[PDB]
Structures are given as structure tokens and as C-alpha cells.
Short mmCIF file of all heavy atoms in Angstrom, two decimals:
data_model
loop_
_atom_site.label_atom_id
_atom_site.label_comp_id
_atom_site.label_asym_id
_atom_site.label_seq_id
_atom_site.Cartn_x
_atom_site.Cartn_y
_atom_site.Cartn_z
N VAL A 1 31.98 4.72 -18.41
CA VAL A 1 31.15 3.65 -17.78
C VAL A 1 29.82 4.28 -17.33
O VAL A 1 28.79 3.66 -17.53
CB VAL A 1 31.79 2.90 -16.62
CG1 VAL A 1 30.89 1.72 -16.22
CG2 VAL A 1 33.12 2.39 -17.01
N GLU A 2 29.81 5.40 -16.70
CA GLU A 2 28.59 6.05 -16.26
C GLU A 2 27.71 6.55 -17.40
O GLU A 2 26.58 6.72 -17.25
CB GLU A 2 28.86 7.27 -15.30
CG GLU A 2 29.25 6.79 -13.94
CD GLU A 2 30.71 6.29 -13.81
OE1 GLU A 2 31.42 6.39 -14.78
OE2 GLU A 2 31.12 5.78 -12.73
N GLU A 3 28.44 6.76 -18.58
CA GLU A 3 27.62 7.26 -19.79
C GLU A 3 27.11 6.10 -20.63
O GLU A 3 26.45 6.45 -21.61
CB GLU A 3 28.71 8.08 -20.58
CG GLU A 3 29.20 9.27 -19.82
CD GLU A 3 28.23 10.45 -19.67
OE1 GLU A 3 27.24 10.42 -20.38
OE2 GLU A 3 28.42 11.30 -18.83
N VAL A 4 27.30 4.89 -20.24
CA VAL A 4 26.71 3.76 -20.97
C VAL A 4 25.79 3.00 -20.24
O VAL A 4 24.95 2.28 -20.79
CB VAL A 4 27.91 2.93 -21.46
CG1 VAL A 4 28.79 3.60 -22.60
CG2 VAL A 4 28.83 2.42 -20.41
N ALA A 5 25.94 3.04 -18.82
CA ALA A 5 25.02 2.33 -17.98
C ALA A 5 23.60 2.88 -18.19
O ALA A 5 22.55 2.12 -18.06
CB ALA A 5 25.49 2.49 -16.55
N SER A 6 23.60 4.17 -18.57
CA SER A 6 22.36 4.83 -18.94
C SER A 6 21.82 4.28 -20.28
O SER A 6 20.59 4.05 -20.38
CB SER A 6 22.56 6.33 -19.10
OG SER A 6 23.40 6.58 -20.17
N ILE A 7 22.71 4.03 -21.17
CA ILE A 7 22.26 3.58 -22.58
C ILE A 7 21.71 2.16 -22.58
O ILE A 7 20.83 1.84 -23.25
CB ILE A 7 23.45 3.78 -23.53
CG1 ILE A 7 23.87 5.21 -23.72
CG2 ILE A 7 23.07 3.18 -24.91
CD1 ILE A 7 24.86 5.51 -24.76
N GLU A 8 22.41 1.18 -21.85
CA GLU A 8 21.85 -0.08 -21.65
C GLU A 8 20.38 0.01 -21.16
O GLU A 8 19.49 -0.78 -21.75
CB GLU A 8 22.71 -0.90 -20.62
CG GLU A 8 22.13 -2.20 -20.34
CD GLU A 8 22.73 -2.94 -19.17
OE1 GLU A 8 23.97 -2.54 -18.79
OE2 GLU A 8 22.03 -3.92 -18.57
N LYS A 9 20.04 0.86 -20.30
CA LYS A 9 18.61 1.03 -19.96
C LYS A 9 17.87 1.80 -21.06
O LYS A 9 16.70 1.46 -21.18
CB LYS A 9 18.63 1.95 -18.67
CG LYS A 9 18.98 1.30 -17.31
CD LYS A 9 18.59 2.30 -16.17
CE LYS A 9 18.87 1.47 -14.84
NZ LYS A 9 18.56 2.30 -13.74
N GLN A 10 18.49 2.61 -21.78
CA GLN A 10 17.85 3.39 -22.82
C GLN A 10 17.42 2.44 -23.92
O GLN A 10 16.28 2.65 -24.55
CB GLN A 10 18.83 4.47 -23.48
CG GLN A 10 19.09 5.58 -22.61
CD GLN A 10 17.82 6.49 -22.51
OE1 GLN A 10 16.96 6.56 -23.34
NE2 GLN A 10 17.80 7.27 -21.38
N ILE A 11 18.09 1.30 -24.15
CA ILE A 11 17.53 0.25 -25.07
C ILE A 11 16.62 -0.62 -24.30
O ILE A 11 15.53 -1.08 -24.93
CB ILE A 11 18.74 -0.40 -25.76
CG1 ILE A 11 19.75 -0.94 -24.75
CG2 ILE A 11 19.30 0.34 -26.96
CD1 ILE A 11 20.87 -1.74 -25.37
N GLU A 12 16.94 -1.01 -23.08
CA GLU A 12 16.21 -1.96 -22.29
C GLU A 12 14.70 -1.45 -22.25
O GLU A 12 13.82 -2.27 -22.14
CB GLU A 12 16.81 -2.08 -20.93
CG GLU A 12 16.02 -2.91 -19.87
CD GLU A 12 16.57 -4.28 -19.97
OE1 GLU A 12 17.15 -4.74 -21.00
OE2 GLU A 12 16.45 -5.07 -18.96
N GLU A 13 14.52 -0.13 -22.28
CA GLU A 13 13.12 0.41 -22.14
C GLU A 13 12.45 0.37 -23.50
O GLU A 13 11.36 -0.17 -23.72
CB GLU A 13 13.17 1.76 -21.47
CG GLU A 13 13.59 1.80 -20.09
CD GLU A 13 13.95 3.22 -19.58
OE1 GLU A 13 13.83 4.17 -20.37
OE2 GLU A 13 14.04 3.36 -18.38
N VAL A 14 13.07 1.06 -24.41
CA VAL A 14 12.48 1.29 -25.81
C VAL A 14 12.16 -0.03 -26.42
O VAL A 14 11.10 -0.14 -27.06
CB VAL A 14 13.43 2.19 -26.72
CG1 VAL A 14 12.86 2.26 -28.06
CG2 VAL A 14 13.63 3.67 -26.07
N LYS A 15 13.03 -1.00 -26.35
CA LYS A 15 12.76 -2.39 -26.88
C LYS A 15 11.48 -2.86 -26.28
O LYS A 15 10.63 -3.32 -27.04
CB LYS A 15 13.93 -3.29 -26.47
CG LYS A 15 15.19 -2.95 -27.28
CD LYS A 15 16.31 -3.99 -26.91
CE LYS A 15 17.50 -3.65 -27.61
NZ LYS A 15 18.69 -4.59 -27.30
N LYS A 16 11.32 -2.75 -25.03
CA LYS A 16 10.01 -3.25 -24.29
C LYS A 16 8.82 -2.37 -24.82
O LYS A 16 7.77 -2.89 -24.90
CB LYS A 16 10.11 -3.18 -22.87
CG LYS A 16 11.08 -4.19 -22.19
CD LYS A 16 11.16 -4.06 -20.74
CE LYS A 16 12.03 -5.13 -20.05
NZ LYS A 16 12.15 -4.88 -18.64
N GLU A 17 9.00 -1.13 -25.19
CA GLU A 17 8.05 -0.22 -25.73
C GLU A 17 7.45 -0.67 -27.08
O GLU A 17 6.33 -1.02 -27.24
CB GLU A 17 8.49 1.25 -25.71
CG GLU A 17 8.89 1.75 -24.36
CD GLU A 17 9.58 3.14 -24.58
OE1 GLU A 17 9.91 3.46 -25.70
OE2 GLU A 17 9.85 3.77 -23.53
N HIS A 18 8.41 -0.91 -28.01
CA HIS A 18 8.05 -1.37 -29.28
C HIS A 18 7.45 -2.78 -29.30
O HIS A 18 6.65 -3.17 -30.12
CB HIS A 18 9.32 -1.25 -30.21
CG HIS A 18 9.57 0.08 -30.78
ND1 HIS A 18 9.07 0.52 -32.06
CD2 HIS A 18 10.25 1.13 -30.23
CE1 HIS A 18 9.51 1.72 -32.28
NE2 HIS A 18 10.18 2.08 -31.16
N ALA A 19 7.91 -3.59 -28.21
CA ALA A 19 7.28 -4.81 -28.00
C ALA A 19 5.85 -4.67 -27.61
O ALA A 19 5.02 -5.38 -28.12
CB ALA A 19 8.04 -5.62 -26.93
N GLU A 20 5.59 -3.80 -26.76
CA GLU A 20 4.28 -3.45 -26.22
C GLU A 20 3.31 -3.12 -27.37
O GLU A 20 2.15 -3.42 -27.36
CB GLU A 20 4.22 -2.42 -25.10
CG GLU A 20 4.62 -2.72 -23.87
CD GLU A 20 4.52 -1.65 -22.76
OE1 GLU A 20 4.03 -0.61 -23.14
OE2 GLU A 20 4.90 -1.84 -21.54
N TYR A 21 3.89 -2.46 -28.35
CA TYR A 21 3.05 -1.89 -29.37
C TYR A 21 2.84 -2.95 -30.53
O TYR A 21 1.86 -2.99 -31.20
CB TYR A 21 3.60 -0.63 -30.03
CG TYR A 21 3.23 0.53 -29.10
CD1 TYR A 21 3.91 0.77 -27.92
CD2 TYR A 21 2.42 1.57 -29.50
CE1 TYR A 21 3.57 1.76 -27.02
CE2 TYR A 21 2.02 2.62 -28.63
CZ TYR A 21 2.80 2.75 -27.45
OH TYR A 21 2.42 3.78 -26.55
N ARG A 22 3.92 -3.80 -30.62
CA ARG A 22 3.75 -5.06 -31.47
C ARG A 22 2.47 -5.82 -30.87
O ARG A 22 1.60 -6.24 -31.61
CB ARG A 22 4.95 -5.96 -31.32
CG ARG A 22 6.10 -5.56 -32.22
CD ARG A 22 7.31 -6.48 -31.93
NE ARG A 22 8.39 -6.21 -32.93
CZ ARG A 22 9.50 -6.91 -32.96
NH1 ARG A 22 9.80 -7.87 -32.05
NH2 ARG A 22 10.48 -6.61 -33.84
N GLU A 23 2.48 -6.01 -29.50
CA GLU A 23 1.40 -6.67 -28.92
C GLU A 23 0.07 -6.01 -29.08
O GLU A 23 -1.01 -6.55 -29.41
CB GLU A 23 1.63 -6.82 -27.40
CG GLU A 23 2.58 -7.90 -27.06
CD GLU A 23 2.62 -8.20 -25.55
OE1 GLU A 23 1.95 -7.48 -24.76
OE2 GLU A 23 3.32 -9.09 -25.16
N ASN A 24 0.14 -4.68 -28.90
CA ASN A 24 -1.09 -3.83 -29.22
C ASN A 24 -1.68 -3.98 -30.55
O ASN A 24 -2.90 -4.22 -30.73
CB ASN A 24 -0.79 -2.34 -28.84
CG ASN A 24 -0.57 -2.04 -27.41
OD1 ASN A 24 -1.14 -2.85 -26.55
ND2 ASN A 24 -0.10 -0.91 -27.17
N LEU A 25 -0.83 -4.05 -31.60
CA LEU A 25 -1.26 -4.14 -32.96
C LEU A 25 -1.84 -5.62 -33.12
O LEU A 25 -2.99 -5.79 -33.65
CB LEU A 25 -0.08 -3.98 -33.91
CG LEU A 25 0.59 -2.55 -34.08
CD1 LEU A 25 1.40 -2.47 -35.19
CD2 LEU A 25 -0.55 -1.49 -33.88
N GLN A 26 -1.13 -6.53 -32.63
CA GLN A 26 -1.57 -8.01 -32.78
C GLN A 26 -2.92 -8.31 -31.93
O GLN A 26 -3.55 -9.25 -32.45
CB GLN A 26 -0.48 -8.93 -32.43
CG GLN A 26 0.70 -8.93 -33.25
CD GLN A 26 0.35 -9.30 -34.74
OE1 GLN A 26 -0.47 -10.20 -35.04
NE2 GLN A 26 0.97 -8.58 -35.77
N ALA A 27 -3.25 -7.54 -30.97
CA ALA A 27 -4.38 -7.95 -30.04
C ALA A 27 -5.65 -7.43 -30.75
O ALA A 27 -6.76 -8.12 -30.43
CB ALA A 27 -4.05 -7.17 -28.67
N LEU A 28 -5.59 -6.44 -31.57
CA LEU A 28 -6.86 -5.95 -32.15
C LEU A 28 -7.64 -7.00 -32.92
O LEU A 28 -8.88 -6.97 -32.85
CB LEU A 28 -6.54 -4.69 -33.04
CG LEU A 28 -5.74 -3.66 -32.36
CD1 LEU A 28 -5.57 -2.43 -33.29
CD2 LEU A 28 -6.39 -3.24 -31.02
N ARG A 29 -6.94 -7.89 -33.57
CA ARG A 29 -7.59 -8.95 -34.39
C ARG A 29 -8.36 -9.90 -33.54
O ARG A 29 -9.23 -10.60 -33.97
CB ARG A 29 -6.51 -9.77 -35.15
CG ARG A 29 -7.10 -10.75 -36.13
CD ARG A 29 -8.24 -10.21 -36.81
NE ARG A 29 -8.89 -11.27 -37.64
CZ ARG A 29 -10.04 -12.01 -37.20
NH1 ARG A 29 -10.34 -11.76 -35.97
NH2 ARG A 29 -10.45 -12.93 -37.94
N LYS A 30 -8.00 -9.91 -32.23
CA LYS A 30 -8.69 -10.78 -31.22
C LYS A 30 -9.79 -10.00 -30.51
O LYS A 30 -10.73 -10.51 -30.00
CB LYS A 30 -7.71 -11.32 -30.21
CG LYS A 30 -8.28 -12.39 -29.30
CD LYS A 30 -7.27 -12.98 -28.44
CE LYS A 30 -7.80 -13.85 -27.34
NZ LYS A 30 -6.73 -14.39 -26.49
N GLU A 31 -9.62 -8.66 -30.48
CA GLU A 31 -10.58 -7.73 -29.71
C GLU A 31 -11.80 -7.71 -30.48
O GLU A 31 -12.93 -7.68 -29.82
CB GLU A 31 -9.90 -6.35 -29.56
CG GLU A 31 -8.79 -6.32 -28.69
CD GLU A 31 -8.31 -4.88 -28.44
OE1 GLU A 31 -9.16 -3.96 -28.47
OE2 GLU A 31 -7.13 -4.64 -28.10
N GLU A 32 -11.94 -7.74 -31.74
CA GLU A 32 -13.07 -7.66 -32.50
C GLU A 32 -13.80 -9.18 -32.59
O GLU A 32 -14.58 -9.37 -33.49
CB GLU A 32 -12.94 -7.14 -33.97
CG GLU A 32 -11.74 -7.71 -34.65
CD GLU A 32 -11.51 -7.07 -36.02
OE1 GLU A 32 -12.48 -6.42 -36.54
OE2 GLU A 32 -10.40 -7.16 -36.51
N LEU A 33 -13.38 -9.92 -31.72
CA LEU A 33 -13.95 -11.33 -31.59
C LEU A 33 -14.69 -11.56 -30.30
O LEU A 33 -15.84 -11.76 -30.38
CB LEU A 33 -12.82 -12.38 -31.68
CG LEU A 33 -12.04 -12.48 -33.01
CD1 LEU A 33 -10.84 -13.40 -32.89
CD2 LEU A 33 -12.97 -12.80 -34.15
N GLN A 34 -14.08 -11.21 -29.19
CA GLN A 34 -14.65 -11.23 -27.83
C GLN A 34 -15.74 -10.22 -27.89
O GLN A 34 -16.75 -10.34 -27.21
CB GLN A 34 -13.58 -10.98 -26.80
CG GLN A 34 -12.38 -11.86 -26.85
CD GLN A 34 -11.52 -11.75 -25.53
OE1 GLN A 34 -11.92 -11.09 -24.62
NE2 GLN A 34 -10.28 -12.43 -25.64
N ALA A 35 -15.59 -9.01 -28.62
CA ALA A 35 -16.62 -8.07 -28.72
C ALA A 35 -17.89 -8.63 -29.36
O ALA A 35 -19.06 -8.48 -28.92
CB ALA A 35 -16.15 -6.93 -29.56
N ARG A 36 -17.62 -9.45 -30.41
CA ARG A 36 -18.68 -10.12 -31.18
C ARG A 36 -19.44 -11.10 -30.27
O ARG A 36 -20.66 -11.27 -30.35
CB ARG A 36 -18.14 -10.83 -32.39
CG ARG A 36 -19.24 -11.15 -33.41
CD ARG A 36 -18.70 -12.04 -34.58
NE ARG A 36 -17.47 -11.38 -35.19
CZ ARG A 36 -16.50 -12.01 -35.68
NH1 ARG A 36 -16.57 -13.37 -35.85
NH2 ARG A 36 -15.38 -11.32 -36.26
N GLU A 37 -18.71 -11.83 -29.45
CA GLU A 37 -19.28 -12.63 -28.41
C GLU A 37 -20.10 -11.85 -27.46
O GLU A 37 -21.30 -12.26 -27.27
CB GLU A 37 -18.08 -13.30 -27.64
CG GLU A 37 -17.37 -14.50 -28.32
CD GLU A 37 -16.42 -15.23 -27.36
OE1 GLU A 37 -15.60 -14.51 -26.77
OE2 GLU A 37 -16.48 -16.42 -27.37
N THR A 38 -19.69 -10.76 -26.86
CA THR A 38 -20.43 -10.02 -26.00
C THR A 38 -21.76 -9.52 -26.53
O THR A 38 -22.77 -9.58 -25.92
CB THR A 38 -19.61 -8.74 -25.46
OG1 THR A 38 -19.16 -8.02 -26.56
CG2 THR A 38 -18.43 -9.28 -24.62
N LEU A 39 -21.68 -8.99 -27.78
CA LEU A 39 -22.86 -8.50 -28.34
C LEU A 39 -23.89 -9.58 -28.70
O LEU A 39 -24.99 -9.48 -28.45
CB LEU A 39 -22.55 -7.73 -29.67
CG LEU A 39 -21.76 -6.38 -29.38
CD1 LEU A 39 -21.35 -5.76 -30.64
CD2 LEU A 39 -22.81 -5.40 -28.73
#
């Protein structure tokens, strides 16, 4: 049990990480818009 409570967290984190990078990739298409506004 002590050896899996760690693993639940091990996925709990990495999943959120790859999620963050999904968001990061998707955000760029919007970044070159607000930039165009600013300029």
C-alpha cells in the first residue's frame, strides 16, 4: 500500500504536466494575436 500511494501521485502529477504542455502548445495560436493587437 505504501508503494502505490506514491504511484497514484506519480500519475496525478505527470498527467497535469502533459496537460499544462497541451495548454502551452494551444496558447501560442492566440499569443500571436494579442501581440498583433499590441503592436
Side-chain angles (χ1 to χ4, degrees):
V1 187
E2 283 77 7
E3 299 286 342
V4 293
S6 63
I7 297 186
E8 178 193 334
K9 283 187 176 181
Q10 288 290 334
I11 46 177
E12 182 88 338
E13 295 172 349
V14 175
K15 291 181 179 178
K16 290 180 180 176
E17 297 170 351
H18 283 264
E20 281 187 2
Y21 286 67
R22 280 178 173 177
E23 283 189 358
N24 284 341
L25 298 192
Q26 293 297 324
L28 306 185
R29 183 49 189 89
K30 188 179 176 182
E31 294 187 25
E32 48 184 342
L33 295 174
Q34 303 189 13
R36 197 187 307 155
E37 283 185 311
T38 56
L39 289 172

